Amino acid sequence: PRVIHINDSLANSSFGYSDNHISTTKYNFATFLPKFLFQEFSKYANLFFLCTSAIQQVPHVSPTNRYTTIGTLLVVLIVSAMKECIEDIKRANSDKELNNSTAEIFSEAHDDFVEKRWIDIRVGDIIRVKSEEPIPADTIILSSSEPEGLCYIETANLDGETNLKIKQSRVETAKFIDVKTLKNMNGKVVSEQPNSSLYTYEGTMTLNDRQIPLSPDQMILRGATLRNTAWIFGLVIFTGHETKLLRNATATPIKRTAVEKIINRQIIALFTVLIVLILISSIGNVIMSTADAKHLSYLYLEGTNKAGLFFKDFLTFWILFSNLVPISLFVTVELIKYYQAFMIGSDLDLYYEKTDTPTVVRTSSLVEELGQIEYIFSDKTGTLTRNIMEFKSCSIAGHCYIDKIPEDKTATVEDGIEVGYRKFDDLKKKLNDPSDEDSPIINDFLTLLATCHTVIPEFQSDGSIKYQAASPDEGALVQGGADLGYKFIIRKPNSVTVLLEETGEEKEYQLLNICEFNSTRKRMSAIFRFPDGSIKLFCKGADTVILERLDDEANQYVEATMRHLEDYASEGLRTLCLAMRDISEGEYEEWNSIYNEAATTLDNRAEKLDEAANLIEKNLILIGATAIEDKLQDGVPETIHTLQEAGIKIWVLTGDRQETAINIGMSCRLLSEDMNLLIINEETRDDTERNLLEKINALNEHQLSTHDMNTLALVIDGKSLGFALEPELEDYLLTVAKLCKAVICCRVSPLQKALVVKMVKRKSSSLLLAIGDGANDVSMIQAAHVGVGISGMEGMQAARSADIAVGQFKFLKKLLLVHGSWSYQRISVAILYSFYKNTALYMTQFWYVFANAFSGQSIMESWTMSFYNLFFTVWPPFVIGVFDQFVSSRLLERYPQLYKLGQKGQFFSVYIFWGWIINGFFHSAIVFIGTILIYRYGFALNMHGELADHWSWGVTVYTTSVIIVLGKAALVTNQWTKFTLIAIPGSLLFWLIFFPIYASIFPHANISREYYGVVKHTYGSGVFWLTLIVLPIFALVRDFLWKYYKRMYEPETYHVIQEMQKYN
Amino acid sequence: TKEGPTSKKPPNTAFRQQRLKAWQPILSPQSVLPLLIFVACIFTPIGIGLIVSATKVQDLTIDYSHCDTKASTTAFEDIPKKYIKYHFKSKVENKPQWRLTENENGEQSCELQFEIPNDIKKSIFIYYKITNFYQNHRRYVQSFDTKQILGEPIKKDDLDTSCSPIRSREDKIIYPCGLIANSMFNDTFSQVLSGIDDTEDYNLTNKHISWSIDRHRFKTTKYNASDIVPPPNWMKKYPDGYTDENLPDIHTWEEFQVWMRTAAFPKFYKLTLKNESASLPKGKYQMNIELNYPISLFGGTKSFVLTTNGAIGGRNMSLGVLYLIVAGLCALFGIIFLVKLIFQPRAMGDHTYLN
């Protein structure tokens, strides 16, 4: 029982409430390390090198320095730590603004509102909120500028709605309007404990000395925003994180990609070859120290202690060959994807001009999947159409009426059901005539278009009136029903008034109760009380959900309206149905109590009131139907034609009728005039089995030619799809949908949009993409792989829960063809090069165990090897993985066939992984056997008979290695930009200068005493400059001659396009 | 900030829009075939130039191992052809001969005797070749105290632990700690080519044979001879322990510095003597070698090398052929790809893609 006192800060302070501070920062200066280390050491590479460093701390085992691995581990750890800290700076910067805005609090000591900050707001302080500024906390409305005390708030942020709401104030508290009289308000405010129900509240406010009941209509959430009212006086109840905006926290799922799984297999491949190289050397060591025990007497070996010799020698080659698993790879590939998302969400061709909404990639872990998408689960309304509705036609009592009959079907033959069109003037003449029988039907129809809805009107200075409707077809019904007779004027709580432009009278309909339109319910109802004393109910929705509630005792307009829905949908018009039912007071006395219990239930409300709503919609008298126009977006016919030309199959999951999607599908160039449609419209589960069997056998009885398989399309409604998703029939449905180039599902439930996406991905291997708008296809986006959200008129519910938010549908032709093919080809080669550059060097450590009696002696310096994966070979991967374009963007869209390269996986696989690995072994052996023939006995210098040694030769190996590694990237790159000349030739000049400086200064500080005299014997020797010229050319003559052959006498698809790009 | 000047339109720069100017390399036959004939054109003079430089080197190797068994004692018998190797600009008439000789208390010596058939104008260098000796062993390459080499009197408990087997003998600090000093090659050379029959001697220089940095870092010790003991393998030259006079000076001892530089391969040379002042005239010479280092310790061999010097070391055609191999592969595929272009061209269209 939360007890709140009006004013009196000393009274409510003893309870110990929270403070209005908001912080979404995960890392703080108090427990940063206890959670960052547990998160960083959870991966494979980090935990592997943690045990390697702990093993390296035993005596007489480490072949290099004691800190050559933990030093490199901390470098890649702080690079990951600074990025984890930068994101927390942006989160802390965003939370600072929410604690910096102004909030004037009524101070009883000053008798006026004193401006303070949000963090200074305390429970029980009366605040004054102005217009167009958000609410700081959960505050009840005491009074406002309106005569009754109501306000119009926009409860976005917490939800996806954009329309306005209405919160009314109690008659006892609406009296205190003046600022000076606020000091007289006093009493207790008993409220509930902080909960998460956004639509429930059961507080109790005791104004003065008498208590009054509360309701959820007198509670504004923190995420809301005042829209039209000038000022509001609010009493804070919940503050800080106790508010229903942050107390109801959410969770985000983690999605893995295809390349991430191939990487996991490539790591196991290197881990197996690691144990092989360790066991080969460890066995050869234990047999040579036993066979040649006399020729190795100058080493003073242990002798009888050979049980632990294998273990000590196992740890030695573990530390030696541990560099074959690059730790710089995971950090590089993470920054490459993070940087590619930046270059994608900053393009002009992906920026919408009409609305400043650029493309944003909320999850940068799914960027490479754009170059390998095969299925697209789309949507009709909003995604394929502009979602701007326009009332065009209507049908009342079996008669159709439009404006300006087109041409031929002017006269009506009256062959039973009326077919044709009339004029709107004939509708008015049929209306005002009291002698007609269908005149009350037309009156009840027109009142349905401007009463049953839930639209808030807005008045302007120009005398006109504007309707702000949440659903775009709602505004079409209000404006369509207004510009011919019954106009909707002003809306207020518990009342709806209309004005008849024919006679000038004004009617007041007492809005007694309403029922919200749910995407699963597919039907809206609203029960009013007419001024005559009757209580008449109105209902509207889809035909697949209203006709089940009709009757047959007194309903003769069914066969007439059903035929009119067919000719409307055959043109592409979005149609609805209208119904009504007169109820009594004997049944409403009990049904009202049922609705009240369903509204104030703490258990569940999203489904409880839906059941109580269908309890009253028993009978329905169909009055007529409507028809609304909706056009396609711009450039959509061109993108779908190009996406299908690239080999992508598009599935449409629409919740509307069937013939509408087929007509807009032919105009959208999705279907065709010669395409064979395969309809499946069944009524029972057994009927769907025979239909699916008749489909599959008729397909396999004959071969499918190229022209035959291309001209197949499956059309299955919602009821038929509900049966074909059972475990017995899901296999029959999936085997017939893979043969048709297009699939059009109709009348699909919101939750059925997820079952279709999950069924295809759990019984196949292709990657799925789901694009849509609104709260009906939010589960479709969360269930697929790459989820795309469209920001349209339905709100911002789907654009926030998606991975990529796009302005419209046109931008998929470039997000997938250009930015997808690049992202896949870039990250693929960048990882293959990272495995090659690391193997081409540390493999010489293996060819050397055959020359040091399998001891495990390092060929190169301990710290010079650690700088390999940190300084000199960390930029060619970034250039080829971010700024590389294997084909021009102008030709990537002209020839959409190139998308099939990445769609099949022709750039990244385990078979190609071994190709780069054994290429490293080949280059490793060339530099090894090449130098040992030149530095034979060390007698390779010409400086007064002096000789080289161990360290003067390891430098030549290290230097020749990086010239071939960087020389390999030169053949890999396709585009030579300014960033390329800095990473490939620039990294070479970096080493040619860093070594004479490092080897002449650091040996004096006891860091690398092995380089005391190696600069003179290398840079001063004429043989060192000749081995660097012939060995790199000798090892890269294979790649140069093979690249010329495959490009010339065995080209691929892009090998010919790159030639046309060059010569044109 | 009520209006909120956001304007999320990204910039139109060449970086953000990925429109940077660049160069696309194409492997046209007109841009590859001239490259292959160019590499062959420049690597052939360099290739034949490096084999001629290695050809002009004149050397002579005499494997003096097994001299205390297979060599004579009373006269100079011929050395088996299995051991001797030589390369000279002129023909050699007399085969090299050797003879064993012992001294007092059993001090053997191998007296080699060879012939130089031509006047060697270049300077003369003399190495010794040790085979099957692994100085690149991990336990061996790091076994030496770097502070004792500088000359400090490091106490026992502060000694480097990388010389654990040979360290602190009989509770006394072994001054040259490690396996590298204890396993030192201790054969002595005559330091003069004794001319025979109308040929004068040819003195050789023992100083300035190690690296310049070695002479700088190797400094005379500051220990007391009553607190140190010689390494185990040095207890023959320094019996009864160390004294104030027996204590060696590792700054002047350049044979110690040359040995401490561990080699990379089990086959390595080590410089000991040289002469850069005058030429070596033709005649017959003799080299006396005290036999102190047994080949049974490391199971390898011992050789006496007498070489000159060239631009690329001394007598080695490994680098010379690599320039000819690369020039050979380029000239090979340079003609293979040329006739394939003349006879059977691709003729795979021009603008017609594969799809």
Ligand SMILES: CCCCC/C=C/C/C=C\C/C=C\C/C=C\CCCC(=O)O[C@H](COC(=O)CCCCCCCCCCCCCCCCC)COP(=O)(O)O[C@@H]1[C@H](O)[C@@H](O)[C@H](OP(=O)(O)O)[C@@H](O)[C@H]1O
């Ligand atoms: C006097 C001797 C001189 C020797 C000269 C030898 C020349 C030929 C040698 C071998 C011929 C064998 C195969 C060569 C013939 C055809 C190659 C076809 C197979 C193949 O491309 O896979 C390669 C792996 O490359 C090795 O795996 C290379 C493996 C080569 C195997 C050689 C033996 C290695 C075994 C290990 C030796 C260990 C020795 C141990 C010694 C121990 C010492 C103690 C893959 O990398 P790649 O850069 O080429 O990829 C290509 C290339 O980038 C380019 O043509 C294409 O793009 P574009 O067209 O748009 O540019 C691109 O799509 C892609 O196709």
Ligand SMILES: *[C@@H]1O[C@H](CO)[C@@H](O[C@@H]2O[C@H](CO)[C@@H](O[C@@H]3O[C@H](CO)[C@@H](O)[C@H](O[C@@H]4O[C@H](CO)[C@@H](O)[C@H](O)[C@@H]4O)[C@@H]3O)[C@H](O)[C@H]2NC(C)=O)[C@H](O)[C@H]1NC(C)=O
């Ligand atoms: C040139 O280099 C040769 C190779 O290192 C070296 O030959 C070795 O010399 C050492 C030193 O004398 C020899 O080690 C001694 O071997 C005898 C058995 O032959 C051991 O009895 C002796 O131990 C003794 O132990 C006594 C009691 O503990 C102690 O009082 C004595 O002082 C002594 O320590 C040594 O272990 C070794 O066998 C020789 N051969 C090999 C293959 O190592 C030459 O001496 C060296 N010559 C010169 C002039 O420096």
Ligand SMILES: *[C@@H]1O[C@H](CO)[C@@H](O[C@@H]2O[C@H](CO)[C@@H](O)[C@H](O)[C@H]2NC(C)=O)[C@H](O)[C@H]1NC(C)=O
């Ligand atoms: C290099 O060899 C020449 C040739 O023997 C040496 O020159 C002789 O040196 C001795 C030593 O005092 C003299 O007695 C001779 O008179 C010198 N002869 C000639 C022709 O100069 C020379 O000293 C040697 N250089 C060294 C050992 O550094």
Ligand SMILES: *[C@@H]1O[C@H](CO)[C@@H](O[C@@H]2O[C@H](CO)[C@@H](O)[C@H](O)[C@H]2NC(C)=O)[C@H](O)[C@H]1NC(C)=O
């Ligand atoms: C140049 O060579 C001569 C000839 O061997 C050296 O003279 C010998 O020197 C040693 C060392 O004192 C004596 O034991 C020999 O008796 C000397 N022999 C003769 C014939 O004089 C001379 O020392 C060499 N030059 C230098 C600088 O050492």
Ligand SMILES: Nc1ncnc2c1ncn2[C@@H]1O[C@H](COP(=O)(O)OP(=O)(O)O)[C@@H](O)[C@H]1O
């Ligand atoms: N406010 C509404 N009230 C009642 N019916 C509606 C309303 N809006 C649309 N409808 C009808 O009920 C159906 C709801 O399905 P819906 O999920 O909106 O399909 P879509 O994806 O094409 O928008 C619609 O096809 C329409 O005929």
Ligand SMILES: *[C@@H]1O[C@H](CO)[C@@H](O)[C@H](O)[C@H]1NC(C)=O
């Ligand atoms: C050596 O001489 C005596 C012991 O013999 C001692 O006093 C002295 O400290 C020792 N060390 C040095 C560096 O003189």
Ligand code: ALF
């Ligand atoms: F086309 Al929809 F929900 F917008 F099915």
Ligand SMILES: [Mg+2]
């Ligand atoms: Mg939609």
Ligand SMILES: [Mg+2]
């Ligand atoms: Mg809808």
